[PDB]
Design a protein around this ligand. Structure first.
Ligand SMILES: [K+]
Ligand SMILES: [K+]
Ligand SMILES: [K+]
Ligand SMILES: [K+]
Ligand SMILES: [K+]
Ligand SMILES: [K+]
Ligand SMILES: [K+]
Ligand SMILES: [K+]
Ligand SMILES: [K+]
Ligand SMILES: [Mg+2]
Ligand SMILES: [Mg+2]
Ligand SMILES: [Mg+2]
Ligand SMILES: [Mg+2]
Ligand SMILES: [Mg+2]
Ligand SMILES: [Mg+2]
Ligand SMILES: [Mg+2]
Ligand SMILES: [Mg+2]
Ligand SMILES: [Mg+2]
Ligand SMILES: [Mg+2]
Ligand SMILES: [Mg+2]
Ligand SMILES: [Mg+2]
Ligand SMILES: [Mg+2]
Ligand SMILES: [Mg+2]
Ligand SMILES: [Mg+2]
Ligand SMILES: [Mg+2]
Ligand SMILES: [Mg+2]
Ligand SMILES: [Mg+2]
Ligand SMILES: [Mg+2]
Ligand SMILES: [Mg+2]
Ligand SMILES: [Mg+2]
Ligand SMILES: [Mg+2]
Ligand SMILES: [Mg+2]
Lengths: 139, 201, 109, 352, 190
RNA sequence: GCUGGGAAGGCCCGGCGGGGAAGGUGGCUCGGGGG
RNA sequence: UGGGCCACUUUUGGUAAGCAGAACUGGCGCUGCGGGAUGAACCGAACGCCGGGUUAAGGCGCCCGAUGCCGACGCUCAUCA
RNA sequence: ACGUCGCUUUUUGAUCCUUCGAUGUCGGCUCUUCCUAUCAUUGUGAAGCAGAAUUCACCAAGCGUUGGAUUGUUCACCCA
RNA sequence: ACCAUCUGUGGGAUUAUGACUGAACGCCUCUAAGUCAGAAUCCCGCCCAGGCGGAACGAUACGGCAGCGCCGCGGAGCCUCGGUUGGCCUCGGAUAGCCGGUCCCCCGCCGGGGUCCGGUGCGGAGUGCCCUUCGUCCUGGGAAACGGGGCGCGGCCGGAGAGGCGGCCGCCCCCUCGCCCGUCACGCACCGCACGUUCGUGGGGAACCUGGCGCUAAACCAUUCGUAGACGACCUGCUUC
């Protein structure tokens, strides 16, 4: 059933806390509740971190457990996570959620205008498809 | 809010849901709870049945017709639980209690309306998966409730009619997605505006 | 052409369990469910608008049955987005659980 | 301290509101459980307590001292002229109980039935159901009537027929008929509506409801006794003759605590005119009632195949405080609640 | 202490296949189909091999009480494989001192009639569970053969017969009469 | 500002090295798989 | 005024006592207020009439002000928790 | 057994907090309800339980637990 | 009047206990997960009462000006009660899993399964969606033109758990408008200021005028009955064959 696992090299996304919104790599695990955590290319220095604020991604790096930050950074940079992360639907929903929050009053007005026209054109075509599909005369 | 809050009672713990509903009605909000037979109580069933049987024992020795009134319907059981969390002997509390409407099953006014959920009172998040719980409908049935079978048949009828609505809703959505593909050239101008501002990823 | 005020609820007076201080009221503002979000509403004018039987003069309008007790948000109450408000006259107890409008007038933005 | 010697309590607490019945007829309160496998039939009937007599029969009970032995047995005669069906009621099962869905009344409601709808038939102008009977003739009304039957057929779970007795066949002073909802059991809802529809305005004799030597339940109101003391109402022990302020009392009506008089203590009040249902009353005979084919035939009422005498069930000089029994009658074993000419409800046994 | 992983694997034979729908194991052997859900246990079920058909049960972060359920599921699954491949056969002997216990098997082996248990006139009517067939053996004089696919149902059907023939108000050490499960075994003997 | 004139840590593949190992990499051995 | 009573601790008689008798300090009596649901004596704190701020002891599911913290680590299932 | 830990308030003491401008003081009679530490009855387990009988224990207070002689008696004792 | 006679009832979850399967503890085990049987106990049924609790149905006020119902938002107004300040018209649910889509198979043209393809910190997302209000006048480009709006009529269908609601046609009568981007100017621009902005033609009570369609009754007292009864109350009768 399970597809994403806590393991050495597993890249996790920080949901809350001082490092919310960052990507980190799991270097080691301690006492079932915390893990040795290091994001050298995402500005998170090595430190303990509860598993509760983590959300596992699909990226797994290859380095030995408790390896130095240099080797984690080399593994992170080779097959770079930063560009791969930005291309996922997960990240671009985070980005879309961010730009919607920063939308100003003028942008809200222009979105209201664009949404109005888009919905009327779409909902026109829905009626046309409905009316077309209504012509069913067959035994 | 000024509109009525319709809460689905299935999967919700009795006391946890009652605490939320009690503060809502004290804040002037109208709350409707449906499917009170689907409400859960933590602890194995036998234990929770003993608690109500102990409640049944509390009666005025001199005149039971005046004593505590033991309601056997799940909706009235939940209603009494909320009443224990309101100042029901003051005019403010009586006004709040009159803002609560409780139902077994989902009656015709609310069967066609969307029903809310309180995560802080849900069994799946509030209760460990290895713990035992009891269904309010079963507890009510075995302590005096008389309408478990008819409510089940009517709930099964309601579910069949809801499936038809969901298939029409899904068919409509499929047609809308096809429409978006059909009119894409005359829509990309407004699609781009939505995407720049976080709507329509 | 618009609501132009935030919806708030007069939950009750500032109080201990067995002592009630009626000069200040605790308001629950809709959508504000944490203390860190109450900063916007501090100092904002709040109004308890109600109707009575006899007509009263309306500023810039014909007399009608609408009356109002004005106030303002003073500070945050608790950790869950409640605010304390002072009104020119202590709010009547019949208004508990009813509408209080927050005006946005003294804007700091 | 504990009472010195044990003794069972006087009277039952299952009949506690020892009050006058709110009704005079005696309602069924529980019809036999319906199973669609059985044929469509009626479950209840109304009769009138004519009087009592006794019979001689032969007992066929093996292993008994009375096997192949004559016995005499008190029987009650309940005059049962045929019902007239004048309506149909539909019920729908709800999580709040059964609620009446729709009622359809037949055309041509008899005057004796229409008297039930009035408190002063003398000063009345007999307008009841005058505008309702017209919808049985016009086209809008008939279409609306067909919709009502169709809605009953698709939404109702149990149906009942409103049937009334025939006063003018009785020897009583009362001309106001008695109406009862009689449940229809045994079949689909469509089948029991078709059965009920074709019995509208018709007569249902007691033969079609009950049969020979079957056990039925009798529902009625007991004889009134007025306001009575504890000695008669609860059959408590009479106090010794030396008692100062009265001996037909209960000496202690409670202890110091709970500091109130409890609901279980015997106290003076109404006795009689209580609603009661007695189960397991055997039908010893269903009498044919008087007939005229060429001459007055009265034999069948009280003639037995051993007796062969041209005599009616009516005693010599008539049933005391009732009159003469002319219609159908049911001969029940034993005694039955109520005074003479008291309306009784006969219900099919709920038991197997 | 919470153990990270407690796992155990059962080996599925070739003539029987196992299909998983969540924690619902469907076993489709030559003798029929056995289906049973385990949604009351929070475990992970996986079909491993396409060649040898391994089924692995895993519990993650389990306490002592819920590590005990790992082998319970495996044992239950192994009985499903055993039931649909060989079946379950319970042999019961009717022991008596004086009154012989007359057993009559009614429709399709689903009803059992016990007549003369301890010489009393009451007739014991024990209904077999669905999918369980009772019969009178032709090998020994006083045997009952209970055959079926589910060990739960076959054994509970046998317990129903055994508990029906219970001596009461007497010394059970002296009045040993009754019908008792003699051996528990399979059909087809493989 | 002080501290062990902070402790760790980052970069300089830290370079000349030495030693230790194991929650043992590669390799090798044994046992189970995909062409 | 010359009837006292209560609490920590020490302490005599008594099986013990919301019993009887002493020592020491504080209290109630003479004292309201916050908390202990409730309560002479406990905990906090002693009081003119008020506004603002902050606390004590005690609390922050709902009654009922305050956790509506993405609180931390464990322990515990009770058919009289 | 020697020891030792409890429970109860249906005994009797101990105390004197309430009542001395008054809470009618024994027993019986009558009547209701409650408890269980179960005599009987229902369902069970155990035996030095062959059967019959009896004893120990469990769930258990739904139901019942009587007529009399002597005594004001509560108690007691006997008859059935 | 046990001093005569008649009648007195079914089910469910389960206790004790005895078991099944089965680990823990490669054995065993009634227990841990999961199951079975199980009683004067418990709950309900049967039975008694029937809520400041509902339902269905009937009849609903004159022979004279006399009361009432429905239809009209029909109008002019009074007295009184105030709340509120966009909507969401619905799968079932699982949580050691879900959601969507598609070809073959089976069910009488859609569902139901088996592949296969996607999504899953839910984006076919309630952290969401829909509607979005300054109004008009010149004036072009796009959207549409298979359009809109008629308390216009008429017909039909679906909804019963409290349906008090929703939908679809036919005919008719009007706008080429209304939606987006532009051109073009105007409107009390009331000279900084609050109760503004909606639901709303709100609820309730008397009363006037205005048209149409309709209705012409009961209850109580008094009298009587005695199936009833302290009194109330209750069961009854009172010009037709
Ligand atoms: K207003
Ligand atoms: K006594
Ligand atoms: K002095
Ligand atoms: K002195
Ligand atoms: K004592
Ligand atoms: K005393
Ligand atoms: K005294
Ligand atoms: K005596
Ligand atoms: K005596
Ligand atoms: Mg006794
Ligand atoms: Mg005297
Ligand atoms: Mg084994
Ligand atoms: Mg014996
Ligand atoms: Mg003195
Ligand atoms: Mg002194
Ligand atoms: Mg002292
Ligand atoms: Mg003293
Ligand atoms: Mg003094
Ligand atoms: Mg002093
Ligand atoms: Mg003080
Ligand atoms: Mg205090
Ligand atoms: Mg306390
Ligand atoms: Mg202050
Ligand atoms: Mg508190
Ligand atoms: Mg609060
Ligand atoms: Mg006194
Ligand atoms: Mg006195
Ligand atoms: Mg007194
Ligand atoms: Mg006991
Ligand atoms: Mg008698
Ligand atoms: Mg057991
Ligand atoms: Mg069972």
């Amino acid at each position: 059933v399970f597809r994403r696992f806590v393991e050495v090299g597993r890249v996790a996304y920080v949901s809350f806390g001082p490092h919310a919104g960052k990507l980190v790599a799991i270097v080691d695990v301690i006492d079932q509740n915390r893990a040795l955590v290091d994001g050298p290319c995402t500005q998170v220095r090595r430190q303990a971190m509860p598993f509760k604020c983590m959300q596992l991604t699909d990226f797994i790096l290859k380095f030995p457990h408790s390896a130095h930050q240099k080797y984690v950074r080399q593994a992170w940079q080779k097959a770079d996570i930063n560009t791969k992360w930005a291309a996922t639907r997960w990240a671009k929903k985070i980005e879309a959620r961010e730009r919607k929050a920063k939308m100003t009053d003028f942008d809200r007005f222009k979105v209201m205008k664009a949404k109005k026209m888009r919905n009327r054109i779409i909902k026109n075509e829905v009626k046309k498809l409905q009316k077309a599909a209504l012509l069913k005369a067959s035994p | 809010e000024v509109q009525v809050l319709v809460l689905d009672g299935r999967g919700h713990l009795l006391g946890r849901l009652a605490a939320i509903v009690a503060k809502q009605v004290l804040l002037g909000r109208k709350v409707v709870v449906v499917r009170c037979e689907g409400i859960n109580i933590s602890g194995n069933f036998y234990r929770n049945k003993l608690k109500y049987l102990a409640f049944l024992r509390k009666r005025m020795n001199t005149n039971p017709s005046r004593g505590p009134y033991h309601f056997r319907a799940p909706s009235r059981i939940f209603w009494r639980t909320v009443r224990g969390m309101l100042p029901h002997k003051t005019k403010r509390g009586q006004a709040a209690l009159d803002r609560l409407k409780v139902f077994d099953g989902i009656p015709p006014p609310y069967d066609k309306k969307k029903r809310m959920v309180v995560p802080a009172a849900l069994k799946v998040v509030r209760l460990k998966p290895t713990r035992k719980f009891a269904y309010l409908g079963r507890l009510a049935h075995e302590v005096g409730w008389k309408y478990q079978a008819v409510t089940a048949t009517l709930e099964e009828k309601r579910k069949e009619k809801a499936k038809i609505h969901y298939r029409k809703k899904k068919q409509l959505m499929r047609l809308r997605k096809q429409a978006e593909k059909n009119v894409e050239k005359k829509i990309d101008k407004y699609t781009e505006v939505l995407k720049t501002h976080g709507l329509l990823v | 052409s618009g609501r132009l005020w935030s919806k708030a609820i007069f939950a009750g007076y500032k109080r201990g369990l067995r002592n009630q201080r009626e000069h200040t009221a605790l308001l629950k503002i809709e959508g504000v469910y944490a203390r860190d979000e109450t900063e916007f509403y501090l100092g904002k004018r709040c109004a308890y608008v109600y109707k009575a039987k006899n007509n009263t003069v309306t500023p810039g309008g014909k007399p009608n049955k609408t009356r109002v007790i004005w106030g303002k948000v003073t500070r945050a109450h608790g950790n869950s987005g409640m605010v304390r408000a002072k009104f020119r006259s202590n709010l009547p107890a019949k208004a508990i659980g009813h509408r209080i409008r927050v005006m946005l007038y003294p804007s700091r933005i | 301290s504990h009472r010195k010697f044990s003794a069972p309590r006087h009277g039952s607490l299952g009949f506690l509101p020892r009050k006058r019945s709110s009704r005079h007829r005696g309602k069924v309160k529980s019809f036999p459980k319906d199973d669609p496998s059985k044929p469509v039939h009626l479950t209840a009937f109304l009769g009138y307590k004519a009087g009592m007599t006794h019979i001689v029969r032969e007992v066929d009970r093996p292993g008994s001292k009375v096997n192949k032995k004559e016995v005499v047995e008190a029987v009650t005669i309940v005059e049962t002229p045929p019902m007239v069906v004048v309506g149909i009621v539909g019920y729908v099962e709800t999580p709040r109980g059964l609620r009446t869905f729709k009622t359809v009344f037949a055309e041509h409601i008899s005057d004796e039935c229409k008297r039930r709808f009035y408190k002063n038939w003398h000063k009345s102008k007999k307008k009841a159901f005058t505008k309702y009977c017209k919808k049985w003739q016009d086209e809008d009304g008939k279409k609306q009537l067909e919709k009502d039957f169709s809605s009953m057929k698709k939404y109702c779970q149990v149906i009942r027929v409103i049937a009334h007795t025939q006063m003018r066949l009785l020897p009583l002073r009362q001309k106001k008929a008695h109406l009862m909802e009689i449940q229809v059991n045994g079949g689909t809802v469509a089948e029991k509506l078709d059965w009920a529809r074709e019995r509208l305005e018709q007569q249902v004799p007691v033969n079609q409801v009950f049969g020979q030597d079957e056990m039925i339940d009798v529902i009625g109101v007991t004889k009134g006794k007025g306001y009575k003391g504890v000695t008669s109402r609860w059959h408590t022990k009479k106090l010794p003759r030396k008692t100062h302020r009265g001996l037909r009392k209960v000496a202690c009506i409670g202890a110091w605590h709970p500091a109130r008089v409890a609901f279980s203590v015997a106290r003076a009040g109404q006795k009689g005119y209580h609603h009661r249902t007695e189960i397991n009353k055997k039908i010893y005979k269903i009498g044919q009632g008087y007939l005229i084919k060429d001459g007055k035939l009265i034999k069948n009422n009280a003639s037995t195949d051993y007796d062969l005498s041209d005599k009616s069930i009516n005693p010599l000089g008539g049933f005391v405080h009732y009159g003469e029994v002319t219609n159908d009658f049911v001969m029940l074993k034993g005694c039955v609640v109520g005074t003479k000419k008291r309306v009784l409800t006969l219900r099919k046994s709920l038991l197997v | 202490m919470k153990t990270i992983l407690s796992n155990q694997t059962v080996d599925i034979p070739e003539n029987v296949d196992i299909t998983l729908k969540g924690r619902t194991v469907i076993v489709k052997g030559p003798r029929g189909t056995l289906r049973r859900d385990f949604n009351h246990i929070n475990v992970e079920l996986s079909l491993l091999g396409k060649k040898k058909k391994r089924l692995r049960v895993d519990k993650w972060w389990g306490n002592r009480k819920e590590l005990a359920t790992v082998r319970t599921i495996c044992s239950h699954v192994q009985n499903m494989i055993k039931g649909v491949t060989l079946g379950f056969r319970y042999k019961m002997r009717s022991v008596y001192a004086h009154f012989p216990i007359n057993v009559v098997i009614q429709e399709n082996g689903s009803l059992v009639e016990i007549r003369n248990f301890l010489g009393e006139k009451y007739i014991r009517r024990v209904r077999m569970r669905p999918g369980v067939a009772c019969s009178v053996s032709q090998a020994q004089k006083d045997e009952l053969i209970l055959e079926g696919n589910d060990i739960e149902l076959v054994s509970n059907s046998a317990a129903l017969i055994q508990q029906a023939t219970t001596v009461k108000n007497k010394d059970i050490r002296k009045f040993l009469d009754g019908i008792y499960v003699s051996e528990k075994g399979t059909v087809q003997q493989a």
